[PDB]
Structure 1
Amino acid sequence: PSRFTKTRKHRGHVSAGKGRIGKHRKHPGGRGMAGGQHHHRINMDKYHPGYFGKVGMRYFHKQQAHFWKPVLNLDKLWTLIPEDKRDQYLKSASKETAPVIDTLAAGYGKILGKGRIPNVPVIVKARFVSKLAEEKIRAAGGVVELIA
């Protein structure tokens, strides 16, 4: 609101907080990003290194949909199973009754292995998987089924 601003407090003080010597002029120093290499170089070299120049190779007509691949770590693998069914699967760790998890149906592309899963067999279906993620899954008695 206007009644809480410092403009109200500056009423009657001549300079309105802008100073008598320097004053409040229109555009001292240029507009926008002017003088980035001449009189604003120091503020660009620090706080913004890498601004000037080009590095990589171009890519004409890039479609982001080609690079869609959300990642899911093993420490959150069991969150895909609904809570009302997690408890019975944890206590009944056995073959011929391993739960099947469709990571693609949950909106994930690749399975990464970061955390630790319980020693319970599980059938994991995914498009991609890291080397470490598969090893931990098989160490618990599970298997990875590649899908498309």
Structure 2
Amino acid sequence: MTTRFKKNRKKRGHVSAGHGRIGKHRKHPGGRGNAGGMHHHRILFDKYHPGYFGKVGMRYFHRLSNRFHCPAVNVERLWSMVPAEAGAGAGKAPVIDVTQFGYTKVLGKGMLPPERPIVVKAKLISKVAEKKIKAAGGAVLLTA
């Protein structure tokens, strides 16, 4: 028996929260702020997945350093790295490579298990305090 305003399930997903209960979230408001001004993206994207293709990754160009020991800016190898302040990379599963990732922030200590030459340098822009008093200098390489 039905009249589809009983078993159909009432009309609206309230009374399951309203006086009945189960599921979802309960005890609601936490912090609030930020608005549409202070907004999107702090990225975390792992270094281990690029570290897989570090060895064959002379498509992000090596130069003075060896074929195996490869300069790669990881910023322009990671898609959608762009709108966020910094991407720092985690090391999950072992890496057995002599890769070199340049980052805007690093999970450094991360560098220590692939200490077999890695090049972990800071990003001038990571500081913030660099004098663009017209002048010239630091930024980060990029692509979409």
Deviation at 1:100, TM superposition (A): 0.2
**2:11 equivalent in structure 1:** 31
Provide the secondary structure at the position in 1 that maps to 2:13. coil
Aligned residues: 107
Deviation at 1:81, TM superposition (A): 5.7
| Structure with greater helix share of residues | 1
Using the size of structure 2 for normalisation, the TM-score is: 0.58
The answer to whether the Cα contact below 8 Å between 2:73 and 2:102 also exists between their aligned partners in 1 is yes
Deviation at 1:96, TM superposition (A): 4.4
Provide the secondary structure at the position in 2 that maps to 1:77. helix
**1:103 equivalent in structure 2:** 74
Q: Which has the higher contact order (CA 8 A, sep 6+)?
A: 2
| Structure with greater strand share of residues | 1
The answer to whether the Cα contact below 8 Å between 1:113 and 1:132 also exists between their aligned partners in 2 is no
How many percent of aligned residue pairs carry the same amino acid?
A: 10
Structure 1, unaligned runs of 5 or more: 1-21, 90-94
**2:27 equivalent in structure 1:** 53
| Distance verdict in 2 for CA 1:115–1:82, change over 3 Å | same
**2:116 equivalent in structure 1:** 140
Using the size of structure 1 for normalisation, the TM-score is: 0.56
Structure 2, unaligned runs of 5 or more: 82-86, 126-144
Amino acid at match of 2:52: W
The answer to whether the Cα contact below 8 Å between 1:74 and 1:113 also exists between their aligned partners in 2 is yes
The answer to whether the Cα contact below 8 Å between 2:72 and 2:100 also exists between their aligned partners in 1 is yes
| Distance verdict in 2 for CA 1:103–1:119, change over 3 Å | closer
Large movers: runs of 4+ above 6 Å: none
For the residues of structure 1 that align with 2:93 and 2:102, how far apart are their CA atoms?
Answer: 18
Deviation at 1:71, TM superposition (A): 0.8
